[PDB]
Amino acid sequence: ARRPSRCYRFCKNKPYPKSRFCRGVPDPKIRNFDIGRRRATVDEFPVCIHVVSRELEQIASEALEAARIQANKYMVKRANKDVFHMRTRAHPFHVLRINKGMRGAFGKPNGVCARVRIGQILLSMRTKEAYVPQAFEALRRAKMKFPGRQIIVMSKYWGFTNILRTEYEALRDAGKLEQRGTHCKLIAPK
RNA sequence: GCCAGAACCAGCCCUACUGCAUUAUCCUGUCGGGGGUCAAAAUCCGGCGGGCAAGAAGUGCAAGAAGGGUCUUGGU
RNA sequence: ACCGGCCCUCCGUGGGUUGCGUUGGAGUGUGCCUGUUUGGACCCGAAAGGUGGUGAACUAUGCCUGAACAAGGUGAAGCCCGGGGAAACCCAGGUGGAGGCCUGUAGCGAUGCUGACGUGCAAAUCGCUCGUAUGAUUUGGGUAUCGGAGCGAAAGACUCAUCGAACCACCUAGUAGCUGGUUCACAUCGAAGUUUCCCUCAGGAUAGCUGGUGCUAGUAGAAGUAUUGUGCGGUAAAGCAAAUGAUUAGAGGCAUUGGGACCUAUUCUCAAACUUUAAAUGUGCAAACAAACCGGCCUUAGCCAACUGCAAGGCCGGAAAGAAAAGAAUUAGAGGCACCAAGUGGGCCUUCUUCGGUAAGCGGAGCAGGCGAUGCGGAAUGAACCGCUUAGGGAUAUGUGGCGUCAAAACUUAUGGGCUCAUUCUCGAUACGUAAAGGGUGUUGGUGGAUAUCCACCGGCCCCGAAAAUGGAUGACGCU
RNA sequence: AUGCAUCCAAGUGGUGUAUAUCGCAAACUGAUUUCUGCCCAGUGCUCUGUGUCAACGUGACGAGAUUCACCGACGCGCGGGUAAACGGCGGGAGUAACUAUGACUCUCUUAAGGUAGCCAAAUGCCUCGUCUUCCAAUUAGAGACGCGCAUGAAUGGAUUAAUGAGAUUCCCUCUGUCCCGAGUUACUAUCUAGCGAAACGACAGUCAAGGGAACGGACUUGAAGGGCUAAGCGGGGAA
RNA sequence: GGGCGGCAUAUCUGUUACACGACAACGCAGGUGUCCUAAGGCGAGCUCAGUGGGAACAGAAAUCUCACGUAGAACACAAG
RNA sequence: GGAAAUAUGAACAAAUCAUACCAGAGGUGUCAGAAUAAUUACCACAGGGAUAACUGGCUUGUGGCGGCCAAGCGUUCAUAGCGACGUCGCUUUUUGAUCCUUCGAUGUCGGCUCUUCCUAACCUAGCGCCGCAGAAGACGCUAAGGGUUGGAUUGUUCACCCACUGACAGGGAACGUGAGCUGGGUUUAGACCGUCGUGAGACAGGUUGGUUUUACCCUACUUAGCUGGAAAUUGCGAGAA
RNA sequence: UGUCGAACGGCAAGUGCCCCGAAGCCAUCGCACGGUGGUUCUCGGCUGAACGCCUCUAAGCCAGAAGCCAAUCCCAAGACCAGAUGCCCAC
RNA sequence: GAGUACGACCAUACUUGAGUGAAAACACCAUAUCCCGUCCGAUUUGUGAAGUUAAGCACUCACAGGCUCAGUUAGUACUGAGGUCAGUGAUGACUCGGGAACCCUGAGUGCCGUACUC
Ligand SMILES: NC[C@@H]1O[C@H](O[C@H]2[C@@H](O)[C@H](O[C@@H]3[C@@H](O)[C@H](N)C[C@H](N)[C@H]3O[C@H]3O[C@H](CO)[C@@H](O)[C@H](O)[C@H]3N)O[C@@H]2CO)[C@H](N)[C@@H](O)[C@@H]1O
Ligand SMILES: NC[C@@H]1O[C@H](O[C@H]2[C@@H](O)[C@H](O[C@@H]3[C@@H](O)[C@H](N)C[C@H](N)[C@H]3O[C@H]3O[C@H](CO)[C@@H](O)[C@H](O)[C@H]3N)O[C@@H]2CO)[C@H](N)[C@@H](O)[C@@H]1O
Ligand SMILES: NC[C@@H]1O[C@H](O[C@H]2[C@@H](O)[C@H](O[C@@H]3[C@@H](O)[C@H](N)C[C@H](N)[C@H]3O[C@H]3O[C@H](CO)[C@@H](O)[C@H](O)[C@H]3N)O[C@@H]2CO)[C@H](N)[C@@H](O)[C@@H]1O
Ligand SMILES: [Mg+2]
Ligand SMILES: [Mg+2]
Ligand SMILES: [Mg+2]
Ligand SMILES: [Mg+2]
């Protein structure tokens, strides 16, 4: 039985990653950071729905999996597996310790958490404009696996790109837009 | 050389009596366009004609040489 | 420059030093306080160590000579008679009185009640029960063995209520960095829990803070502050599209390969021990009176090929907003020395930064301020919070906090606006200061959509979530 | 005995020794019965005598002191003996015609690898071992089995009749131990006459909550409280 | 708490450490008691790590050659 | 005796020998530098709450008890009853951590006795709801008024079975309660065993034997007496349910 | 059993012992007795809107737990009773 | 308007790829008897002067990479002082001050000194 998340919710220490100094750190519980059609293109899924953190806290890697194993569930239950793409924009890079205030008290690594901030995006699921209301409900359920307070906002940008939903058309049709991968870059003069 | 009361000096502490500037996104006058009403006055917006809203403003600064205290000091 | 020591040398009108040296003496005797030191050493206090004597009337053991041990049971050897047998020998009835034998008095012990008593009858006793009671038995008198020794059927037991080293006197008022105590008043000043070293960590010495004495030409060689000029920095932030360390993912480069390697541009996400860049807060120096500034002169075995240049120490003369104007400083700003010596060297709390920890009224740091050591006015109460800091008193006015009663003040103020209803720890209510996720067609505002009605969101108060051991707490009553 | 152990400051000193190996002195174990296994490497003792070990003695250099050289015994070195001296007495891996099991084999290591026995024993961590018995039910008891944390042979092993104020368990009788208490007696307490202390004692003495050196008799806010007595009693006074 | 354990008992680089300096903990990450007649001193010449194109035996790796190569090498050692 | 020859052994002089002055080396790792093994359960002294073992405090990892989300379980189905992955918490009957209070002493376990409290309700009173036909029962609500046993083994809290019952709920009060008891157990001195130690001895290993002292004081509580006082003693201070 | 010489009467043995024993005390070891009203929680409802219908709730009502509060029961005026009374005194 | 030698700052000067280059000078270039040094006349040393601007050098040109400089990001991040501020808290705003960084965008792409020379 692991120690509860009540013990590690607050950013009380400096960031303590895996380096050439701390070398017994376990494998974090989240391994897949993208669910859905990650092979897909930019103009496949226009809309973007975020899960933004309203707290300065540490989310454990055990909660990043629990929020992602369950957001995948309600999507394939109430849609297909080929309409969404939920990127998890938090990575467990800070390593927690356990003393398993006494002589020789500096702990050993047992778990890894994500030091998240105010306004830092936690989840991001780009979907189609048809199947939007199934995505507000998959992300309402996924933030229950999260500590702290989160909001589910509607992003004004076209998917995972840095270009607006107002100003995406006549920018691929003006030809000025470099679509590489899952993101875009406005071509400028060199 | 005790206890009270008033009086009057001086000192000090209170509170009455107020001027200089400032108004304008404002005052007033009528023709509009707007309103509502039984009809129409108003709220509201706009033309150019006048302006001082005059213990008029709760806006800036105030220097206006007293009636009351003084078992809140000293004196005769 | 000279004196002494030690040297170097190019041998000097030369270098380097060292002394508790010299450069027109400051000693010395005494009185008195202070401090260090040693003596009983401010007072009282160990466990101990040593010397020499007294004890075997308690009790441990040996020896000499005396004394003591009811009444029962069991019944050993030997002895007598009978019987069986060929013999070897067996079998029976008595007799007898053996034993570290048995029951049980006295005596000698002391098992259980964990009885009584437990400021007793008693510094070990009383009661009943129990062990033994012809033996390694009990006991008198006499004798013999003792203090690092005696004696011990051995328990470190006993040696005159004293024993894992007796008792007496002494050395000895042993020594204590440890505990306790330390006797009049007022006045003037007033700390430290930190540094370094220590067989040091409950102690010291040392520097600091502190007092006393002063000395020296009362603004001087001043400053926990600014301003202007000129230096130093790598923390916060930023970045990973820049090196290093991590770390997701898609895009194809096509021949660069094997059952994403590889390459090129991007990307999601990070770094106390990473960094291109880089703050705020800090930190160094300068800002005209022994000083720099301006034009010659003297000197030097300094430098340079040389001096007319350079470097150095003087000399002579000059100028000097005594530092302008540009926001262009301010000062309850006498500067500089020295002697002597206390107490302290357990700290603790807090805003902020921070480390270990799940956490802690936890442990450890940084800058400052506090308590310690300090009340007073407030937070009902509280070392540390808020206000304020303190001679003995008045008057006025405040601060923090208050104005329904307790309790001074709105004798429950306004001729201000909203919000709130809560039915067994009972809505709520003075910061520090000790319930959450989540939910509500309770009410009250907002935002964005739609056809007077719906829909998604967000806020305020209120309710649910919300369960402990004396009766109970916004401080009490109460207040709507 | 020209001794052994030993007193002893000392001597022609003292004890066992008034003795004389059927004795005296020093140890161990603990009646009988039955046995007492292996280990002499370690550490002790002990025995037979050429490395090294002091003083003395010897010789030499030198003016001599000082040096140097040689000789130099016990004792350790070297070799034996000794366990009823102190003590000690192993680890892996495979193997039988069903499985298991392992007579069997292999390997490593030792001074020797624990023999006869005994056992969850007063010695067993796991452990309230497992099996059987005893009870309606037993972490207890007895008998077993031993994979013995860590049993084991005069550091004595095993066993035993008789004996024990020894430790344990069951059964019978028995009962106020209990269900569940009652009632009587003597002596107290209690009341009087006479007599008359001690322990103790800052001051004192009602509580709830709050705070506080984080369990208040005193402080804060509440709740009680007329004074003074006699017998009790054991919650507080961190008595 | 003391004991065992350890060394935080003399000492070095990074970090903690809060952009001067100074700053604690049985705080974090590692070192130290040695080593060298050259691994010291100096002068000259040279360029390293690595990758790419090539050359009998000869391959991913032997050695020759060329190019690129701000140090990605090296400087006895821990680190800077 | 100087610019220049090292100096002393103090009545002198020579030669030996020692010494001195200068610069190193041989070493103190506890590194500003004494030359150091245990044991004590036979124990002592001065102290320390500067510091441990018992309670109290803080914390709550750990131990107990929940809610929120809903992948799943339930033939069907998220929630009758459950509910992973997460997550937010309550609790102080566990334990750890700490070291605040006590070392010129707070008697350190469990029984026995007795009273009270709390609710997170086992039985009893009303209920709602079920994958509730009845009968038994799951879950929940208001409620702590009342009740909650007899035993075998164990020193036990605990555990474990036997049996009765409507039911044999869980806790608090200095782990309630030793001038209330008991003393089984921990927790001395004796002795035995095993393992350890060369030994003296050691042992959160087993075994056996091992003084439980004081109330007459203040309060509290239980009963038992006496006796004033409305300005709660006085003012004469005048209030009639 | 001892002892007043024996009988009689007794006495001693901390009440010698044995049997029966009044009275008193006492046993779940016997016997008798142990009662009413409301309030309102959960809850189920009634009217009834907000919200032209619906709805236990928002106003308002109903029924209602071994809880709670009274009645009964026990102490009782320091709860200071001009509650009532008997008899004396004093105004 | 340029060269060469010594240079100061040390990319606005570097890197890559093209283009152009009067004179003179630098430079490739020729060579090995001496001086000298190599496995090698490659480098290096000496001695030269037939050849060529092919290359170095110089200059010019890239919606070049870089570098440099403003601007933007942005009064944003962060931070000094304050509160009986708000919030269960995490933290946030306010008040008095200071005030970034990358991305991005624009610009231009060496400059000054001595001696000798065309
Ligand atoms: N010298 C006298 C002898 O006594 C003899 O008398 C003896 C016999 O009669 C008889 O002897 C008996 C006998 O009965 C029988 N057969 C044999 C038995 N052993 C004997 O028994 C004898 O000896 C035994 C010992 O064993 C004893 O115990 C006992 O005293 C005695 N009776 O007992 C007598 C001994 O006491 C004869 N008369 C005879 O031979 C002769 O006279
Ligand atoms: N010790 C070495 C010599 O022995 C000698 O004495 C020796 C003998 O003379 C003497 O032995 C004699 C014995 O022989 C003769 N029969 C009579 C005498 N009683 C013994 O003496 C004995 O008695 C007493 C015990 O009380 C012991 O102390 C002693 O040792 C013992 N040996 O015992 C000694 C043995 O060593 C001398 N005393 C003297 O020279 C020296 O001591
Ligand atoms: N003489 C010795 C010989 O070896 C044998 O000795 C054997 C055992 O005694 C001994 O083994 C041990 C022993 O060391 C230890 N001390 C006791 C243990 N119980 C024995 O265990 C032996 O006995 C038990 C029970 O009988 C068996 O179940 C077991 O299998 C066996 N190993 O080692 C040997 C292994 O079997 C015989 N006992 C003996 O009869 C034979 O003669
Ligand atoms: Mg007998
Ligand atoms: Mg002993
Ligand atoms: Mg103060
Ligand atoms: Mg006996």
PDB file of N, CA, C and O (backbone and C1' of nucleotides) in Angstrom, chain F residues 119-140:
ATOM      1  P     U F 119     -22.401  11.332  21.218  1.00  0.00           P
ATOM      2  O5'   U F 119     -22.233  10.180  20.145  1.00  0.00           O
ATOM      3  C5'   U F 119     -21.127  10.180  19.256  1.00  0.00           C
ATOM      4  C4'   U F 119     -21.039   8.896  18.477  1.00  0.00           C
ATOM      5  C3'   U F 119     -22.318   8.491  17.744  1.00  0.00           C
ATOM      6  O3'   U F 119     -22.008   7.987  16.452  1.00  0.00           O
ATOM      7  C1'   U F 119     -21.602   6.735  19.144  1.00  0.00           C
ATOM      8  P     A F 120     -22.853   8.487  15.189  1.00  0.00           P
ATOM      9  O5'   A F 120     -22.598   7.366  14.095  1.00  0.00           O
ATOM     10  C5'   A F 120     -21.305   7.189  13.547  1.00  0.00           C
ATOM     11  C4'   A F 120     -20.905   5.742  13.481  1.00  0.00           C
ATOM     12  C3'   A F 120     -21.204   4.910  14.725  1.00  0.00           C
ATOM     13  O3'   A F 120     -21.416   3.552  14.344  1.00  0.00           O
ATOM     14  C1'   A F 120     -18.878   4.980  14.365  1.00  0.00           C
ATOM     15  P     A F 121     -22.838   3.049  13.785  1.00  0.00           P
ATOM     16  O5'   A F 121     -23.559   2.426  15.059  1.00  0.00           O
ATOM     17  C5'   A F 121     -23.067   1.244  15.679  1.00  0.00           C
ATOM     18  C4'   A F 121     -24.171   0.324  16.144  1.00  0.00           C
ATOM     19  C3'   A F 121     -25.211  -0.067  15.099  1.00  0.00           C
ATOM     20  O3'   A F 121     -25.617  -1.415  15.314  1.00  0.00           O
ATOM     21  C1'   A F 121     -26.281   0.989  16.924  1.00  0.00           C
ATOM     22  P     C F 122     -25.125  -2.577  14.326  1.00  0.00           P
ATOM     23  O5'   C F 122     -24.760  -3.774  15.298  1.00  0.00           O
ATOM     24  C5'   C F 122     -24.901  -5.122  14.890  1.00  0.00           C
ATOM     25  C4'   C F 122     -25.157  -6.013  16.075  1.00  0.00           C
ATOM     26  C3'   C F 122     -26.559  -5.965  16.652  1.00  0.00           C
ATOM     27  O3'   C F 122     -27.498  -6.729  15.925  1.00  0.00           O
ATOM     28  C1'   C F 122     -25.004  -5.790  18.403  1.00  0.00           C
ATOM     29  P     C F 123     -29.014  -6.225  15.836  1.00  0.00           P
ATOM     30  O5'   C F 123     -29.590  -6.501  17.286  1.00  0.00           O
ATOM     31  C5'   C F 123     -29.787  -7.818  17.765  1.00  0.00           C
ATOM     32  C4'   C F 123     -30.483  -7.794  19.095  1.00  0.00           C
ATOM     33  C3'   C F 123     -31.742  -6.954  19.160  1.00  0.00           C
ATOM     34  O3'   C F 123     -32.882  -7.602  18.634  1.00  0.00           O
ATOM     35  C1'   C F 123     -30.386  -6.459  21.013  1.00  0.00           C
ATOM     36  P     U F 124     -34.011  -6.756  17.881  1.00  0.00           P
ATOM     37  O5'   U F 124     -34.643  -5.856  19.020  1.00  0.00           O
ATOM     38  C5'   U F 124     -35.447  -6.423  20.039  1.00  0.00           C
ATOM     39  C4'   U F 124     -35.753  -5.412  21.112  1.00  0.00           C
ATOM     40  C3'   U F 124     -36.540  -4.193  20.667  1.00  0.00           C
ATOM     41  O3'   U F 124     -37.927  -4.426  20.549  1.00  0.00           O
ATOM     42  C1'   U F 124     -34.733  -3.525  22.043  1.00  0.00           C
ATOM     43  P     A F 125     -38.695  -3.893  19.251  1.00  0.00           P
ATOM     44  O5'   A F 125     -38.900  -2.348  19.544  1.00  0.00           O
ATOM     45  C5'   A F 125     -39.536  -1.885  20.723  1.00  0.00           C
ATOM     46  C4'   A F 125     -39.917  -0.438  20.575  1.00  0.00           C
ATOM     47  C3'   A F 125     -40.308  -0.033  19.169  1.00  0.00           C
ATOM     48  O3'   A F 125     -41.649  -0.359  18.860  1.00  0.00           O
ATOM     49  C1'   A F 125     -38.737   1.503  19.998  1.00  0.00           C
ATOM     50  P     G F 126     -42.104  -0.490  17.332  1.00  0.00           P
ATOM     51  O5'   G F 126     -42.531   0.990  16.962  1.00  0.00           O
ATOM     52  C5'   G F 126     -42.805   1.347  15.623  1.00  0.00           C
ATOM     53  C4'   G F 126     -42.347   2.746  15.325  1.00  0.00           C
ATOM     54  C3'   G F 126     -42.064   3.018  13.865  1.00  0.00           C
ATOM     55  O3'   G F 126     -43.236   3.289  13.130  1.00  0.00           O
ATOM     56  C1'   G F 126     -40.263   3.799  15.157  1.00  0.00           C
ATOM     57  P     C F 127     -43.747   2.227  12.050  1.00  0.00           P
ATOM     58  O5'   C F 127     -43.275   2.851  10.669  1.00  0.00           O
ATOM     59  C5'   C F 127     -42.067   2.423  10.076  1.00  0.00           C
ATOM     60  C4'   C F 127     -41.121   3.564   9.828  1.00  0.00           C
ATOM     61  C3'   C F 127     -40.388   3.479   8.506  1.00  0.00           C
ATOM     62  O3'   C F 127     -41.144   3.972   7.417  1.00  0.00           O
ATOM     63  C1'   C F 127     -38.818   3.808  10.218  1.00  0.00           C
ATOM     64  P     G F 128     -41.800   2.934   6.389  1.00  0.00           P
ATOM     65  O5'   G F 128     -40.918   3.090   5.084  1.00  0.00           O
ATOM     66  C5'   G F 128     -40.884   4.326   4.401  1.00  0.00           C
ATOM     67  C4'   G F 128     -39.473   4.745   4.100  1.00  0.00           C
ATOM     68  C3'   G F 128     -38.779   4.014   2.973  1.00  0.00           C
ATOM     69  O3'   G F 128     -39.168   4.490   1.696  1.00  0.00           O
ATOM     70  C1'   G F 128     -37.312   4.206   4.806  1.00  0.00           C
ATOM     71  P     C F 129     -39.684   3.486   0.554  1.00  0.00           P
ATOM     72  O5'   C F 129     -38.383   2.697   0.114  1.00  0.00           O
ATOM     73  C5'   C F 129     -37.394   3.293  -0.704  1.00  0.00           C
ATOM     74  C4'   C F 129     -36.148   2.451  -0.721  1.00  0.00           C
ATOM     75  C3'   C F 129     -36.296   1.057  -1.307  1.00  0.00           C
ATOM     76  O3'   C F 129     -36.222   1.039  -2.720  1.00  0.00           O
ATOM     77  C1'   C F 129     -35.174   0.925   0.764  1.00  0.00           C
ATOM     78  P     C F 130     -37.025  -0.053  -3.576  1.00  0.00           P
ATOM     79  O5'   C F 130     -36.218  -1.401  -3.355  1.00  0.00           O
ATOM     80  C5'   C F 130     -34.930  -1.540  -3.921  1.00  0.00           C
ATOM     81  C4'   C F 130     -34.250  -2.831  -3.544  1.00  0.00           C
ATOM     82  C3'   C F 130     -35.009  -4.127  -3.734  1.00  0.00           C
ATOM     83  O3'   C F 130     -35.109  -4.519  -5.094  1.00  0.00           O
ATOM     84  C1'   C F 130     -33.767  -4.193  -1.723  1.00  0.00           C
ATOM     85  P     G F 131     -35.850  -5.881  -5.530  1.00  0.00           P
ATOM     86  O5'   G F 131     -34.672  -6.938  -5.651  1.00  0.00           O
ATOM     87  C5'   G F 131     -34.905  -8.282  -6.049  1.00  0.00           C
ATOM     88  C4'   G F 131     -33.593  -9.009  -6.166  1.00  0.00           C
ATOM     89  C3'   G F 131     -32.593  -8.625  -5.084  1.00  0.00           C
ATOM     90  O3'   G F 131     -32.678  -9.481  -3.958  1.00  0.00           O
ATOM     91  C1'   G F 131     -31.615  -8.324  -7.231  1.00  0.00           C
ATOM     92  P     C F 132     -32.564  -8.891  -2.471  1.00  0.00           P
ATOM     93  O5'   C F 132     -33.998  -9.155  -1.833  1.00  0.00           O
ATOM     94  C5'   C F 132     -35.188  -8.632  -2.407  1.00  0.00           C
ATOM     95  C4'   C F 132     -36.346  -8.762  -1.451  1.00  0.00           C
ATOM     96  C3'   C F 132     -37.724  -8.998  -2.041  1.00  0.00           C
ATOM     97  O3'   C F 132     -37.928 -10.345  -2.432  1.00  0.00           O
ATOM     98  C1'   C F 132     -37.847  -7.416  -0.281  1.00  0.00           C
ATOM     99  P     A F 133     -39.087 -10.724  -3.473  1.00  0.00           P
ATOM    100  O5'   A F 133     -40.402 -10.830  -2.583  1.00  0.00           O
ATOM    101  C5'   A F 133     -41.629 -10.287  -3.040  1.00  0.00           C
ATOM    102  C4'   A F 133     -42.803 -11.040  -2.479  1.00  0.00           C
ATOM    103  C3'   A F 133     -42.664 -11.514  -1.044  1.00  0.00           C
ATOM    104  O3'   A F 133     -42.987 -10.503  -0.107  1.00  0.00           O
ATOM    105  C1'   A F 133     -43.497 -13.271  -2.396  1.00  0.00           C
ATOM    106  P     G F 134     -42.289 -10.447   1.335  1.00  0.00           P
ATOM    107  O5'   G F 134     -42.773 -11.769   2.067  1.00  0.00           O
ATOM    108  C5'   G F 134     -44.091 -11.885   2.584  1.00  0.00           C
ATOM    109  C4'   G F 134     -44.337 -13.261   3.149  1.00  0.00           C
ATOM    110  C3'   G F 134     -43.420 -13.662   4.283  1.00  0.00           C
ATOM    111  O3'   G F 134     -43.861 -13.172   5.531  1.00  0.00           O
ATOM    112  C1'   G F 134     -43.477 -15.386   2.685  1.00  0.00           C
ATOM    113  P     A F 135     -42.812 -12.502   6.537  1.00  0.00           P
ATOM    114  O5'   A F 135     -41.847 -13.703   6.921  1.00  0.00           O
ATOM    115  C5'   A F 135     -42.292 -14.775   7.734  1.00  0.00           C
ATOM    116  C4'   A F 135     -41.223 -15.825   7.862  1.00  0.00           C
ATOM    117  C3'   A F 135     -39.839 -15.319   8.237  1.00  0.00           C
ATOM    118  O3'   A F 135     -39.672 -15.085   9.622  1.00  0.00           O
ATOM    119  C1'   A F 135     -39.659 -16.764   6.398  1.00  0.00           C
ATOM    120  P     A F 136     -38.758 -13.865  10.121  1.00  0.00           P
ATOM    121  O5'   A F 136     -37.298 -14.214   9.579  1.00  0.00           O
ATOM    122  C5'   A F 136     -36.300 -14.788  10.417  1.00  0.00           C
ATOM    123  C4'   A F 136     -35.100 -15.254   9.624  1.00  0.00           C
ATOM    124  C3'   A F 136     -34.034 -14.206   9.335  1.00  0.00           C
ATOM    125  O3'   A F 136     -33.140 -13.984  10.410  1.00  0.00           O
ATOM    126  C1'   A F 136     -34.574 -15.300   7.332  1.00  0.00           C
ATOM    127  P     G F 137     -32.855 -12.488  10.912  1.00  0.00           P
ATOM    128  O5'   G F 137     -32.157 -11.779   9.670  1.00  0.00           O
ATOM    129  C5'   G F 137     -30.861 -12.168   9.249  1.00  0.00           C
ATOM    130  C4'   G F 137     -30.583 -11.789   7.814  1.00  0.00           C
ATOM    131  C3'   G F 137     -30.201 -10.347   7.543  1.00  0.00           C
ATOM    132  O3'   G F 137     -28.865 -10.047   7.889  1.00  0.00           O
ATOM    133  C1'   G F 137     -31.740 -11.067   5.918  1.00  0.00           C
ATOM    134  P     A F 138     -28.417  -8.525   8.107  1.00  0.00           P
ATOM    135  O5'   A F 138     -28.103  -7.997   6.642  1.00  0.00           O
ATOM    136  C5'   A F 138     -27.101  -8.601   5.842  1.00  0.00           C
ATOM    137  C4'   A F 138     -26.955  -7.886   4.528  1.00  0.00           C
ATOM    138  C3'   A F 138     -26.767  -6.385   4.626  1.00  0.00           C
ATOM    139  O3'   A F 138     -25.443  -5.998   4.942  1.00  0.00           O
ATOM    140  C1'   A F 138     -28.441  -6.840   3.047  1.00  0.00           C
ATOM    141  P     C F 139     -25.195  -4.817   5.998  1.00  0.00           P
ATOM    142  O5'   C F 139     -25.719  -3.528   5.240  1.00  0.00           O
ATOM    143  C5'   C F 139     -25.078  -3.071   4.065  1.00  0.00           C
ATOM    144  C4'   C F 139     -25.857  -1.948   3.444  1.00  0.00           C
ATOM    145  C3'   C F 139     -26.133  -0.766   4.347  1.00  0.00           C
ATOM    146  O3'   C F 139     -25.037   0.095   4.554  1.00  0.00           O
ATOM    147  C1'   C F 139     -28.113  -1.360   3.239  1.00  0.00           C
ATOM    148  P     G F 140     -24.852   0.778   5.990  1.00  0.00           P
ATOM    149  O5'   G F 140     -26.055   1.813   6.088  1.00  0.00           O
ATOM    150  C5'   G F 140     -26.049   2.993   5.307  1.00  0.00           C
ATOM    151  C4'   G F 140     -27.401   3.656   5.263  1.00  0.00           C
ATOM    152  C3'   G F 140     -27.857   4.364   6.516  1.00  0.00           C
ATOM    153  O3'   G F 140     -27.207   5.595   6.750  1.00  0.00           O
ATOM    154  C1'   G F 140     -29.653   3.148   5.619  1.00  0.00           C
TER     155        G F 140
END
